[PDB]
Structures are given as structure tokens and as C-alpha cells.
């Protein structure tokens, strides 16, 4: 695997409050030149993955985008519900990162290597920010290193 990706450590955030949510830790490591940060670790919720798939389906190769786990008719917090959604998210990313065309998606790179919100990504990839995509990812890499990933 030229790109290593793992969706791990799912957690119910703000448990019990009106705006509780589940998010997922995304770990990536690659030597590919397409990525600004050689290693990255972010947290994202399912609703952001749904947005990310829509961005990817606008690609110029008309390449298929892997399916996501289904949407829920309830707020799911069971261990089994969360694990199966975690498995499907990892499969989704593993498949996405095997496509050269999808590796040109700037939103994907900010999704994976920064903690910018979805609107912030949209503003950055539309030329409405002071910083470039590469600058944002590099600054996050300096800000977010915590020595959890040893070189091989």
C-alpha cells in the first residue's frame, strides 16, 4: 500500500448533551509526493464524509467513488453501530486513495491532513483564504505533532 490509512478510535463527544456526536480518528502515512505532510492524524464525523464523497464525485476522470456506510434514521451510539460505520469508512478511504484522479482532490487533502471545517475547506480551495492548501496542511503538521508515530 503506497498510502497507509486507518480510521480508528471512534468516540461519542459531548455525551448526553443536545449536540453530542460521534467522530473518527483518521491516521495517514505515505511517502507519496502528492501529500504535503508525511504523516497526519485528524478527527472527522460521518456527516463530513458524506460531504467529502460529493466533492469526489465531481472528478474529471468520471471515476467511481466508493460507497459510504448508510445514513441513519436515529443518532446511533451502540458499539456495533459505531464499529461497522468505522469499518465502512476505512474501506471508503482505502479505496479512494488507490485512485490517482481522486488524489488530485484538494478538499480530500484538507479533509485528511488538517482540522479545517468543511466551510473553511470550501473557502480555501476557492481562493478565499490568505493561506494555500499546502500552507494550511504544513501548519497543522507543526501544530499537531505529538510523537505517536515512529519512523519505519
Kindly state the number of chain residues that form the binding site for Cl ion, as judged by CB under 5 A: 21
The Cα 37–Cα 31 span in angstroms is: 9
Nearest approach, Cβ of residue 64 and Cl ion (Å): 23
List 2, 4, 15, 87, residue binding Cl ion (CB under 5 A): 15
Contact between 108 and Cl ion per CB under 5 A: no
Query: Which of 110, 94, 115 shows the shortest CA–CA distance to 55?
Result: 110
- x/- binding map, residues 21-50, to Cl ion, per CB under 5 A? -x---x-x--------x--x-x--xxx---
State the virtual CA torsion across 105, 110, 112, 113 in degrees, nearest 10.
130
In contact, 26 and 4? CB cutoff 8 Å: no
- x/- binding map, residues 82-101, to Cl ion, per CB under 5 A? --------------------
Which stretch in 64-72, 88-96, 104-112, 123-131 sits in contact with Cl ion by CB under 5 A?
A: 104-112
Contact between 117 and Cl ion per CB under 5 A: yes
> Is 71 labeled as ligand-binding?
yes
Which is it for the CA torsion 56, 118, 12, 36, positive or negative? Answer: positive
The Cα 10–Cα 22 span in angstroms is: 7
Nearest approach, Cβ of residue 106 and Cl ion (Å): 14
Residues flagged as binding site: 45, 71, 85
Amino acid at each position: 500500500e503506497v498510502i497507509t490509512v486507518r480510521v480508528q478510535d471512534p468516540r461519542v463527544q459531548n455525551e448526553g448533551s443536545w449536540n453530542s456526536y460521534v467522530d473518527y480518528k483518521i491516521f495517514l502515512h505515505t511517502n507519496s509526493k502528492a501529500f504535503t505532510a508525511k504523516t497526519s492524524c485528524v478527527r472527522r464525523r460521518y456527516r463530513e464524509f458524506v460531504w467529502l464523497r460529493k466533492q469526489l464525485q465531481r472528478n474529471a476522470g468520471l471515476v467511481p467513488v466508493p460507497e459510504l456506510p448508510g445514513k441513519s434514521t436515529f443518532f446511533g451510539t451502540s458499539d456495533e453501530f459505531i464499529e461497522k460505520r468505522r469499518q465502512g469508512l476505512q474501506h471508503f478511504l482505502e479505496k479512494v486513495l488507490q485512485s490517482v484522479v481522486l488524489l488530485s482532490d484538494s478538499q480530500l487533502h484538507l479533509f485528511l491532513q488538517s482540522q479545517l471545517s468543511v466551510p473553511e475547506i470550501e473557502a480555501c480551495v476557492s481562493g478565499q483564504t490568505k493561506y494555500s492548501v499546502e500552507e494550511a496542511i504544513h501548519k497543522f503538521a507543526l501544530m499537531n505533532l505529538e510523537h505517536h508515530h515512529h519512523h519505519h
